[model samples]
Target: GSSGSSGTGVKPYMCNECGKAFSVYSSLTTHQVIHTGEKPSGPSSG
Candidate 1:
């Protein structure tokens, strides 16, 4: 939680390790990719 306002409905949560922004705590885990350089995660069929 950093900067934002109720009048503006701005998002304030940002990852301290990567500076990535997220509105929800659950979403923050996905936003941490900036630090790991991790690629898209999914089921691979090859």
Candidate 2:
């Protein structure tokens, strides 16, 4: 892990909203919620 929290591998995933990068795409996808308040449709879309 490079950062020890995230970006364990080569950080290829990047957030277009703030330009923050992550090693994983899912991490980036989750981080995107900060920019887009759109609720993710799930069993509990709360």
Candidate 3:
């Protein structure tokens, strides 16, 4: 019975690279890019 918007609850999605948690799995995948050292789509890379 939780009701709030202050990050008071734990997120179900977690990053396997750095143990980081996100509210959505998509976010976690996006975060893993850092560990993978890969740029996301639509991003210019040198």
Candidate 4:
């Protein structure tokens, strides 16, 4: 889950700014913080 691998073999979520693919939408949302320069206030998954 941490890796965000959906295991479904279908990754449709993508970042518009970087074109990076993520298996989960939440993972993509989380990744968006990098472009926004906004750090998550919760625990670090990495």
Candidate 2's TM-score reads 0.57
Question: lDDT values of the candidates?
Answer: 0.62, 0.71, 0.72, 0.72
Deviating ranges (above 4 Å) for candidate 4? 1-10, 38-46
Q: In candidate 2, where is summed lDDT lowest over 10 consecutive residues?
A: 37-46
- Weakest ten-residue segment in model 4 by summed lDDT: 37-46
The top-ranked prediction according to TM-score is 2
Q: Write the per-residue lDDT of candidate 3 for residues 1-46, one digit (tens) a residue.
A: 4567886578888877667778777888888787776545564332
Model 1 lDDT per residue over 1-46, tens place = 5565565455567787845666887788776654555566555321
For candidate 1, give the lDDT: 0.62
Summarize candidate 2's per-residue lDDT along 1-46 as a digit string, tens digits.
4656553544689877777888787999888887676666545322
Two-way lDDT contest, 2 vs 3, winner: 3
Candidate topping lDDT: 4
Q: What's the true lDDT of residue 35 in model 2?
A: 69
The lowest-lDDT stretch of 10 consecutive residues in candidate 3 is 37-46
lDDT per residue, candidate 4, 1-46, as tens digits? Answer: 5454565455689888776888788999998777775655655433
TM-score of each: 0.37, 0.57, 0.54, 0.54
**Model 1 residue 15 CA deviation in Å:** 0.3
Clashes of 1: 0
